[PDB]
Write a protein that binds this ligand. Structure first.
Ligand code: PQQ
Ligand code: PQQ
Ligand code: EU
Ligand code: EU
Lengths: 576, 576
């Protein structure tokens, strides 16, 4: 989108969830820096009017901040000229409350998009809605997903050219994952690209994987599944999307292949679950695709963000795609072709020895592959992954990544799953615990990572999983939150915490930084615990059954999360 | 209670809602003062895990802070030694959700009491519960009120000697108001003192009103009503209680006489609605009582706090009771006998000329007394009163009062009311608007008031009603919050605002100040809009029917409250 290509370069603005189309989450602002961040204090706050998990972050476009909440998905515009703000408008959509019953992993929403004087929001119950950015009035809406089939929407949409791109959730409900594109003016659907099924539904371009046919091709959307299991094939699309206008490609990842009982998917790769897609925004046709986890047996969703840095590879500047997958590997691909440049573990991994550079497939450790009716013990990372949706940041100054991570493992037993539309389609008993097969006393880490070397440059061990995606700045700082409510500023060179404050609820928001109309730098973040690891707190679940929340209940109580935080929903804005 | 008599004098503590048994809301702490308050910043915050109105404030006893929420009445103990706090324990009672439907004025709760290693809480659905202060273990619980009769509890209990004193709400539901006393160790009910009915239920001591028989006597609980209308007589007891151990008297006020249609109560004073009671805590027997508003026709509940200062009256140190009533008069009584020393308006009053010095009765302006089936226009104050429950503060240094006030008026039409147990028993159509018969552009004020002279010293006009009870300190400061979220410190000598910060939701909490284990002074307040004036926001009521919420909906929309604030529930703690 032409306006967005201009706006994303403006240091004071934050016009899409991960700052820019490359998803770097990096700001050139340096008013706040390593020498003065100890003077950071709360400037103002704003209640979202909802409880449970507050993911994503606000947008700042012009002099207006746009704020979004957990279900029922309140949206607000704040006029930042009004000292410190006034509520310019608010909007709450009408929704089918049955959506709450079919959300796997809390009633979260990863936030708004902005383009051409319009705000775009998704709703848990499956709507894409366009609002006038200045008045908050509804311009159009479309039903993109159906809760009666176990579908929800939690992901943030992306505007590319004159289209808004919208995914779906339900990989635990047998949903057919897909991305739909809607005209931003009319709301008319232009295309719909599925993650499995016939080529007619997947949408492949004539040059699909031309350079790397070993990565897959025509027919694989059905032929890599037994019988017609692809009909319940998952590959949902609830993570972060990126875009390279110079290549005319947008990128995203796809979820687990539906049922968690891999026995019922046996015989093939189950493409295109657990896959990185590169697609043409005009037509939705795929130019390339790389499947990270063939025949998944761990719930290693592929949906984490696709950061688009230009890195020096073998002494050559290369347009890359960098992705820290749930499966524990940090992938570096050539974003033109899907060539695998590097893949190394960014957390402790024991389900695979490595990703082979001979065939770009995991070299599996057979004893860690799950099966039906037999428990598999001590798999790392667990299903919540090396990291979950919480997005990493990239500094073009240092050339390094700043990555929120999990340090957890699990036992996982497949069981036969039966499909009933609108009900869970899982088929696993999962018990989760701390890292290195229950040897560690901490459950998260914030790291600095060199993607091409596969090296953790430094690490901050965190008691809880780090479920907050950092913002990194030219001031030499990374900001992130913890699940017991600490908001922290770290020196990116040293890994030292320079400033921190305890907020009212666990932080699963991704902080932003922006300039107000006063030309002053602010840092803003949502507080309000929830998401998958926080589900015991968000949904008030007892400790009696540790298998509940598909393993999340047991591990949260072991980590002490219910003793560490309450639910909330608050936007906090800091300044010097 | 002897422990509390000692604890209330310790500057670093805040062991009952209004600081001490005299309800002065005054702290001797002077670390924070007029010279340095500009350096006040947020230290930490804590989400209460609830939305809607957050009234009262936290307690600080030893190194533990006790926090309470709106329905469903979450209670927390925060260990303040844990840098800055850890959650020591939490408790949430099981409640009958039917309580929500019979709450007149939002699902608020005015807070906890502490005594003898126990925390005492009330619940909306009518329970009084004792918890172990160190572990949160439930020790006993008793049913005090019955939601099936339209009774709820919103008031904070008071511990006196070995008894916890508990009131009831339901003056809009034909409830018989009363105070009950429960043994703090066993929970056994000791006595129950009604606000109307026969003497055996009202509980009169042999010296009741001995010095002032003109204030009423034996039999008036039935004789001052037509027929048996006292059986639906209101006089509920949802405000703040005070205690003088030297006199062995506790004090409180009583609500409106039930139906808002005065025609159905015609013929007498309707005692003891709208009354100040002084009772013996051992037996519940009344030593004196003074009815402020005989045969009420405005819903001027008498429940506002009974502050117990020692004032110099004609050169003589005198034990007084000072009360800023809903009816707009600031009363000063001798707290030994109920003698009226002074009564003058603290807001604009047009329903009465004065309180008669001959017989201590309002000299009414007949055109402003309401009637059945005909509107009465331009009554000031309106039913929300000169001030509502939000408690005033007293400084023993200045001898003056610091009072949050409303600036509003109304039209009020009586309507025939029919009683159905559990359903509303109102009988009025009320429209509310700004002060001075709709001429003013502001709806509130924070004032300094000289009670004996009967004069305002200074006033801060506030756009919204001030629904937050100030804390006043030896540092020369008053702290209070506004309904659009501003927390403010003002110079008590002049009313100048010295410091302010915009919080996430309108403030209807009463701030406190205390010393942490670090020996630093903190100021704490709840944010989370609601209560009667905030009901349009808390209950999400539309503007199309301005009569809704007993008139509160129309006036909130006209003042712009729904455009100024969202719902929330957060504790904010500030320090230098
Ligand atoms: O397969 C799916 O459709 C799907 C959807 C979502 C979601 O929509 O939040 C999550 C997951 N899977 C998932 O596997 C997961 O670990 C997860 C964590 C969270 C969260 O917000 O904390 N959502 C989701
Ligand atoms: O008559 C009653 O029993 C009763 C109860 C309550 C309550 O329980 O909060 C209020 C009132 N009356 C009332 O008249 C009133 O103006 C009021 C304001 C509020 C509030 O918390 O903002 N409660 C109440
Ligand atoms: Eu999944
Ligand atoms: Eu009342």
């Amino acid at each position: 989108n032409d306006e967005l290509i201009k706006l994303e370069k403006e240091p004071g603005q934050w016009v899409m969830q991960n700052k820019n189309y490359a998803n770097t989450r990096y700001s050139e602002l340096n008013q706040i820096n390593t020498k003065n961040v100890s003077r950071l204090r709360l400037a103002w706050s704003f209640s979202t009017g909802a409880l449970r998990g507050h993911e994503g972050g606000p947008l700042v476009v012009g002099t207006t901040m746009y704020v979004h909440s957990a279900y029922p998905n309140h949206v607000y515009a704040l006029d930042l000229t009004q000292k410190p703000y006034a509520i310019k408008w608010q909007y709450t959509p009408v929704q089918n409350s049955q959506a709450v019953a079919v959300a796997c992993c809390d009633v979260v929403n990863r936030g708004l998009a902005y383009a051409n004087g319009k705000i775009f929001m998704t709703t848990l119950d499956g709507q894409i809605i366009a609002l006038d950015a200045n008045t908050g009035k509804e311009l159009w809406k479309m039903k993109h997903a159906d809760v009666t089939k176990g579908e929800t929407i939690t992901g943030a949409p992306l505007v590319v050219k004159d289209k808004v791109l919208v995914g779906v959730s339900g990989g635990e409900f047998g949903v057919r994952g897909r991305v739909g594109a809607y005209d931003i003016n009319t709301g008319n659907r232009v295309w719909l690209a599925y993650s499995q099924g016939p080529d007619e539904e997947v949408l492949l371009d004539s040059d699909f994987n031309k350079e790397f046919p070993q990565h897959g091709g025509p027919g694989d959307g059905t032929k890599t599944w037994p019988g017609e299991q692809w009909k319940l094939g998952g590959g949902t699309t609830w993570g972060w999307y990126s875009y390279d206008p110079a290549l005319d490609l947008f990128y995203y990842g796809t979820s687990n292949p539906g049922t968690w009982n891999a026995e019922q998917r046996k015989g093939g790769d189950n493409k295109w679950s657990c896959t990185i897609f590169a697609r043409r925004p005009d037509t939705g046709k795929a130019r390339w695709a790389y499947q990270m986890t063939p025949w998944d047996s761990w719930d290693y969703d592929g949906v984490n963000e696709m950061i688009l840095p230009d890195l020096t590879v073998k002494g050559k500047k290369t347009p890359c795609l960098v992705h820290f997958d749930r499966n524990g590997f940090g992938y570096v691909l050539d974003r033109r072709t899907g060539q695998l440049i590097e893949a190394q573990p960014f957390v402790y991994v024991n389900w695979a020895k490595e990703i082979s550079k001979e065939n770009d497939r995991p070299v599996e450790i057979p004893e860690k592959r799950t099966k039906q009716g037999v428990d598999t013990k001590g798999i790392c990372p667990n299903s919540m992954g090396g990291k979950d949706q919480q997005p990493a940041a990239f500094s073009p100054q240092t050339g390094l990544f700043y990555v929120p991570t999990n340090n957890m493992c699990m036992n996982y037993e497949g069981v036969e799953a039966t499909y009933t539309a609108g009900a869970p389609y899982v088929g696993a008993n999962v018990l989760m615990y701390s890292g290195h097969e229950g040897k560690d006393d901490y459950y998260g880490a914030f790291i600095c990572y060199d993607a091409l070397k596969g090296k953790r440059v430094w690490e901050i061990h965190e008691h809880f999983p780090v479920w907050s995606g950092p913002v990194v700045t030219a001031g030499g700082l990374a900001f992130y939150g913890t699940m017991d409510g600490w908001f922290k500023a770290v020196d990116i060179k040293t890994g030292k915490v320079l400033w921190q404050q305890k907020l009212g609820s666990g932080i699963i928001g991704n902080p932003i930084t922006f300039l107000g109309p006063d030309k002053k730098q602010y840092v803003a973040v949502y507080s309000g615990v929830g998401g998958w690891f926080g589900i015991a707190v968000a949904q008030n679940l007892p400790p009696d059954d540790p298998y509940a929340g598909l393993g999340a209940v047991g591990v949260a109580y072991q980590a002490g999360l219910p003793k560490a935080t309450t639910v909330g929903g608050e936007l906090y804005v800091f300044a010097l």
